[PDB]
Design a protein around this ligand. Structure first.
Ligand SMILES: *[C@@H]1O[C@H](CO)[C@@H](O)[C@H](O)[C@H]1NC(C)=O
Ligand SMILES: *[C@@H]1O[C@H](CO)[C@@H](O)[C@H](O)[C@H]1NC(C)=O
Ligand SMILES: *[C@@H]1O[C@H](CO)[C@@H](O)[C@H](O)[C@H]1NC(C)=O
Lengths: 445, 445, 445
């Protein structure tokens, strides 16, 4: 809906609210088959140029098959094993006798079909390429006589086009040990992906979500290689199921908060930690510390709970009262006052320290705001760029309302002499405990 | 010019000087257009193989267009938004009525043309592919009658070649949400890029710089997707403008500096921080902490100020006097004495501790130097490899002069009992303050 | 052989044993040549469509050559220079007069041949593509008369197929500054790679190792561009030599170990550091801290000593007695008790703290184990998934024996009041020294 922001002058942090999250909680697996032709090499008296072209492209087909075979003889472990049991379980059933034969029978007359496998799983199977019909109908009469028949030039071109997708799939499955992500258009065309979404047990509102964000769905999908057996190449595509929909989400931005004394060696700094994406999830908050685990489109966020930490909902109270006893808000300390800026969703935090020249400009008016020393913020309303030293950042021109929440910077409530200035993973109450221990050591002395 | 190095035995660090830097300070945007053909699907009585091949490749063209359309209906946010306002501003003008019509008129007779847009911007527009002329002249008489005309086999091949670039551009813009970097040869051929450089408002010496380093220019460029409207596919290429040229640059190398006592638990360590690239920039120093933000060719360095910190020029004094009061030189402390090596531009720093077997060899002479415990350095003059434990590093055979600056290791000026051994972001004066506080706690006790 | 595991309840860590390692200790270089045709552009009266197609593909060949030339005029430095001297040394010899002429003579009649170069190096050279013979025999009579001869349509297609590999090689060498890794099938086909392995000075058991793990070999190989000179395009492929074979290897898994008091602010935490792969190597242990430097297939591990640290073999004693004086086992401390899990090779460590809902389920039985607060472990025998908060991890279904080594968690031997709770790189004896210093400051007070 309406994206809003709140800059907290006291902690040098901003919160971008109003995003609707879609969290991955399940997987929907589907079998993608390619019917191949078991045609060991055949040699006939051949010289005409069309026959040579056919045997060359046919040799590229034979090698793609032996290569997928050496990929499946020994399958190297991947860093994705913790996210693919759903699909590996389908591949293990397919290796059973008769299971590849069932899908070969269901897709005998149609391209798409639901097939009830062993393990009681009603999976949706599909056949995106048919090389067995093409090689056996158009090519075998051409290489399985005493002397080769002459194929027309249209067949030579059509076979290079059809065989291409097999080769590109073989290239991707080979360089990535059978597990590819994102799922490319070679693994699944956009036309095949949307029809696959349409044939899923999800709400009509959920099909609209995935169909309008196909690139994000591709980036949160996996393609797993199964088996080459009985003239069938099968591989599993693991598509995301978003069990959490339209959940409130926000993004925390933090920047160093130092004191602005003029004598070096007398300044202390604090920075809030755990910046990133937060989403309400099942009575708790799902936090995403890595930056690439959440894709954003407009007001919408797509996260994977695979790379999240589960925190109590009281973690949001670091945003309204950082000194609040229900949650131990985390900070880091240092004496490292280098100027920097963070481009938020609707503005910019600027931490200006020392002699750094910090400013905010409009493209036609020029410099419209000069930051003094400390931590400050400017909205995107009327601002295009922000300069810190020799670096120019661009402000997001997204529509929304910014709110500047005035307050005394909390770094000023701390005595420099007893401050712990090198904590790398501390907490507000931890630092206070270090101050009580440094104050007991001076009373005693 | 002449690359030189200075190893500082006192701080276990080396500085590689003599590089000439080219820092990105601006962007030069250009519009790249592809004229497409609005030919909704047309069906005629067709069976001949050439007609089938044409309709298949034509179907691949129709899907590439609907896919670029679903990419532009909802454009996902990227981590590059802080670096692309220059190009997003051109796309927003193109969405105005009449603006795509202007560039369609300027490139009616020629491929390249400067076009004055709204917003007073004289951008250089180009038309690298013409599918509207080819489909409407060679293909439409073939599918827009009662029965399809038979196209010759040369047309079938020429259309698969021309249509290919559209498909590869669609693949890259789709998997990357409309923003690609580096800019591939599909987005812009080397022939098109060099002619685009030649037609820029830069010095003759600056065109020679970018033309001789096209791969680095590609790696520091962005390709942004604009709009598909009125049979025109437009996308913006953002090329770097190096406002800083031939500026002095240097690279700092640091390695842990420990004491070499024989009893474990009695050794302390120090390591200089902020290793990376430094360049003189507008009265200050631009520091690049990330390693991949600066590309090196010979004596030349290409950095992006987007990922830099602006530091006072006194930061260079950590290299000549680390105990110097004008700048608080930063260090890290530990008791972690593991042997390691750093390959510098003209030699190697070796931090040898414990029982580790450290050496420097020549390919035909063998081991020519055995390092004892502590931090040392060897030039590339006569040295090919350096071995630390079970690891063999290769020495850069670049020509230059190395200078070994002798001095007492500063770790020896510190008493172990009161040393702070676990600081992760400290400073020379900070550590001295921790020593004064630990010395007041023992006087008191 | 048999993969086994040991979970140590006292330190919240697990060790996966039984892997056989293959460590890279050497390089085997090979020259890959492509004979090109020096045919500056030639123009004849041309209009027929086959001639146009030939000149278009020929123009793509001419540009691929000028592009490889601008790549070799100025070669940008790469982060791989410390691992490629073996191949750069072959390129420097090839630039000598007569050296490219020798390999051009040895591969005049055959595709593969061993060639003794200057520098006494008996390298294996190969010629994977012949464009000089094809252009000069099939194309030059077509563009080097007064008017162009008409080539048959088979030649037009065969030239687009042959020229393709040159263009794909030019694309990869251009975007990566002459050094590519992994080595793609365009640089070296699987058929060419296996024949290259077969012709190497290695044991019959070592050829079987590399031939059965070609994708891992590709990922641990480099392709380096040499020179374009006298109608010859040469580039060096650096293949790994595994000097260490069948060496014992193990993987250490660590998870935070906190106390489980009910009052926040009274809990302390410890986590073992240096998680990753360890292999016995030449009387010491080769440790691999980065996760991507070791590829695993079944019981087998493939590491590169380029990114390893050499540690004494006593480092294994942190696994049986962490309080052991022969090695100072490393830990990190905090007060950061967030629940998490680590999927091991044969089970899962679960660090459950606070109100987090931690469990282990079987697909058909449901929740079979509920973890209480502290650090615990569950084997893969009967367990499919493990849930921590809102995150579901998948358990590896690999066969092996797990051993739960019971013991009191060592975090309970520490008094909270004097514990150092913010160390980021500490050691067991270091922390004890901080406790002795905090105990002297309270006796004194
Ligand atoms: C520090 O001492 C004050 C004084 O009584 C007390 O109120 C506060 O709770 C103490 N802080 C901690 C973190 O124990
Ligand atoms: C530590 O004490 C000495 C003794 O007077 C003083 O000279 C020095 O400046 C002090 N160091 C710091 C960092 O305050
Ligand atoms: C701390 O003091 C005890 C008491 O004598 C001693 O045994 C121990 O070795 C000391 N620890 C360190 C790390 O010096």
């Amino acid at each position: 809906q309406n994206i809003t922001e709140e800059f907290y002058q006291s902690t040098c942090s901003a919160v971008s609210k109003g995003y609707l999250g879609a969290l991955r909680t399940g997987w929907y697996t589907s079998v993608i088959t390619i019917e191949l032709s078991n045609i060991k090499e055949n040699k006939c008296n051949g010289t005409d140029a069309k026959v040579k072209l056919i045997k060359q492209e046919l040799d590229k087909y034979k090698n793609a098959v032996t290569d997928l075979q050496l990929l499946m003889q020994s399958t190297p472990a991947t860093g994705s094993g913790s996210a693919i049991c759903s699909g590996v379980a389908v591949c293990k059933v397919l290796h059973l006798e008769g299971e590849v034969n069932k899908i070969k029978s269901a897709l005998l007359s149609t391209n798409k079909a639901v097939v009830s496998l062993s393990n009681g799983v009603s999976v949706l199977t599909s056949k995106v390429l048919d090389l067995k019909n093409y090689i056996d109908k158009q090519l075998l009469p051409i290489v399985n006589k005493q002397s080769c028949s002459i194929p027309n030039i249209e067949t030579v071109i059509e076979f290079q086009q059809k065989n291409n997708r097999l080769l590109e799939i073989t290239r991707e499955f080979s360089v990535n040990a059978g597990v590819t992500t994102p799922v490319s258009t070679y693994m699944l065309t956009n036309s095949e992906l949307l029809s696959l979404i349409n044939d899923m047990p999800i709400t009509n509102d959920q099909k609209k979500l995935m169909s309008n964000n196909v690139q994000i769905v591709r980036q949160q999908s996996y393609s797993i290689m199964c088996i080459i057996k009985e003239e069938v190449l099968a591989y599993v595509v693991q598509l995301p199921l978003y069990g959490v929909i339209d959940t409130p989400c926000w993004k925390l931005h933090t920047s160093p908060l130092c004191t602005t004394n003029t004598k070096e060696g007398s300044n202390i700094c604090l920075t809030r930690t755990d910046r990133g994406w937060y989403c309400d999830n099942a009575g708790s908050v799902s936090f995403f510390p890595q930056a690439e685990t959440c894709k954003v489109q407009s007001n919408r966020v797509f996260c994977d709970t695979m790379n999240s930490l589960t925190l109590p909902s009281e973690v949001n109270l670091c945003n309204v009262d950082i000194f609040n006893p229900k949650y131990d808000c985390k900070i880091m300390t240092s004496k490292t006052d280098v100027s920097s800026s963070v481009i938020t969703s609707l503005g910019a935090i600027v931490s200006c320290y020392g002699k750094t020249k910090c400013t905010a400009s409009n493209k036609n008016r020029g410099i419209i705001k000069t930051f003094s020393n400390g931590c400050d913020y400017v909205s995107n309303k009327g601002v295009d760029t922000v300069s810190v030293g020799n670096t120019l950042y661009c402000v997001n021109k997204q529509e929304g309302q910014s709110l500047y929440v005035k307050g005394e910077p909390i770094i000023n409530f701390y005595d420099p002499l007893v401050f712990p200035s090198d904590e790398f993973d501390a907490s507000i109450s931890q630092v206070n405990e270090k101050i009580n221990q440094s104050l007991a050591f001076i009373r005693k002395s």
